[PDB]
């Protein structure tokens, strides 16, 4: 009956361009229980009216988590033209969304640190002539089109990955470039929160 946040507290978290997503329906949550397990640094939210995020019922609660350094904390705002908001992670502009940046504490050992931070600095699709470039901008609450061709971790800074598409899909190529940002001493991650609404069920209320 209680929403299970356990997949976040185990193993290694993914990168920003291949984030892991957890959807919560028909359960009760305790956001203070979660944020107490991480040193919370910076965070932001947008939109209310019901109004809350830890004191309201919704039809669903979406939570994306990924390893992200606080060095590029400014690249997460929607008003930024950085590759993160352009090719990696864009959250919903219409629905009420939140965005939390925290660090994995030293007393939280179940989460093992990845080798380094990784993100997509450019994801574009080239046509049959191999000259026309089409930037594949990421949509809100979607993955990059180049996720199918990029490793779960960028191996070296300045790497290029390309794969020829099938003639049924249109032919051409899909090319993406990777960038690496060296790891910190404590794992820094970013959490993306979005809430939906429906007429049928509202079984996503806070635990009281």
């Amino acid at each position: 009956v209680e929403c299970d946040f356990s997949p976040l507290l185990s193993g290694t978290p993914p990168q920003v361009y291949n984030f892991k997503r957890l959807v919560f329906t028909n359960c009760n949550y305790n956001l203070t229980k979660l944020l107490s397990l991480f040193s919370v640094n910076d965070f932001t939210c947008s939109q209310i009216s019901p109004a809350a995020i830890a004191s309201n019922c919704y039809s669903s609660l979406i939570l994306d988590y990924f390893s992200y350094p606080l060095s590029m904390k400014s690249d997460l705002s929607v008003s930024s033209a950085g590759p993160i908001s352009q090719f990696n992670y864009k959250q919903s502009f219409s629905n009420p969304t939140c965005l939390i940046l925290a660090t994995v504490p030293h007393n939280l050992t179940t989460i093992t640190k990845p080798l380094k931070y990784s993100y997509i600095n450019k994801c574009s699709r080239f046509l049959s002539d191999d000259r026309t470039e089409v930037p594949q901008l990421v949509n809100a609450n979607q993955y990059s089109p180049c996720v199918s061709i990029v490793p779960s971790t960028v191996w070296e800074d300045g790497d290029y990955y390309r794969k020829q598409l099938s003639p049924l899909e249109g032919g051409g190529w899909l090319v993406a470039s990777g960038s690496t940002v060296a790891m910190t001493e404590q794992l820094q991650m970013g959490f993306g929160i979005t809430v939906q609404y429906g007429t049928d069920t509202n079984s996503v209320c806070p635990k009281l």
């Epitope: 997949p7 199918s148 061709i149 490793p151 779960s152 191996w155 070296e156 390309r162």
Partner: antibody, heavy 117, light 108 residues
């Protein structure tokens, strides 16, 4: 159009060291990534290690990392595999292949290496 | 490491049947899974990359899917060309583990 061809002795004496060279035709090794994969006769696949002719540093399997090394050649458009202290369990069909994220787009005709005195 | 449990190890089916081959990972691989077809005495042939994306020039009978942490390769209509050994591979983290393989053999 990118092709591959393995070139090996086929028989390696037990105590000594085996060298396996992979020839890539129709593409440059100074881009993308490449790797080696072996398969013992009658069992599954074992991934040796990935490397890069573009970067290019490597990443190997810890089960064979202490006995595996790799050389790279740009002009000859090839790369070799060096496995020392081979045992009777190292009898396998070795494949070299291309990659971009860990999968394998193109494989080469595997070469057999048998170790026995 | 992350290790793969592919099942069934072998199955007997005939032409026209629908056969599903599953593959479970010890940890979450985040859809970074690939399928291969291996004919006897030949190199593995890539069929599916990123769990569900079909390779170029591969028939539409082959499809990829994911439910929970189980990855399934389903051949809608089996045919004579498809009787071989199939493998699943993960490339989420090193070292890259391989499936034991599933041998699809014609049934008498």
């Amino acid at each position: 159009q990118v092709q591959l061809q393995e070139s090996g002795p086929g028989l390696v004496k037990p105590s000594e060291t085996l060298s396996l060279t992979c020839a890539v035709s129709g593409d440059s090794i100074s881009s993308n990534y490449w790797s080696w994969i072996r398969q013992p006769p009658g069992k599954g696949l074992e991934w040796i290690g990935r490397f890069s002719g573009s970067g290019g540093s490597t990443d190997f399997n810890p089960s064979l990392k202490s006995r595996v090394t790799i050389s790279t050649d740009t002009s000859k458009n090839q790369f070799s595999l060096n496995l020392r202290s081979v045992t009777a369990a190292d009898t396998a069909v070795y494949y070299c292949a291309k990659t971009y994220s860990g999968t394998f787009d193109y494989w080469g005709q595997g070469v057999l290496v048998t170790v026995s005195s | 490491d992350i290790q793969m449990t592919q099942s069934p190890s072998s199955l007997s089916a005939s032409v026209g049947d629908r056969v599903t081959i599953t593959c479970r990972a010890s940890q979450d691989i985040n859809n970074y899974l690939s399928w291969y077809q291996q004919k006897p005495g030949k190199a593995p042939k890539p069929l599916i990359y990123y769990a569900s994306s079909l390779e170029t020039g591969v028939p539409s009978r082959f499809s990829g899917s994911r439910s929970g942490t189980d990855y399934t390769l389903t051949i809608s209509s089996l045919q004579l060309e498809d009787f071989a050994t199939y493998y699943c591979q993960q490339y989420n983290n090193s070292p890259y583990s391989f499936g034991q393989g599933t041998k699809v053999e014609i049934k008498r």
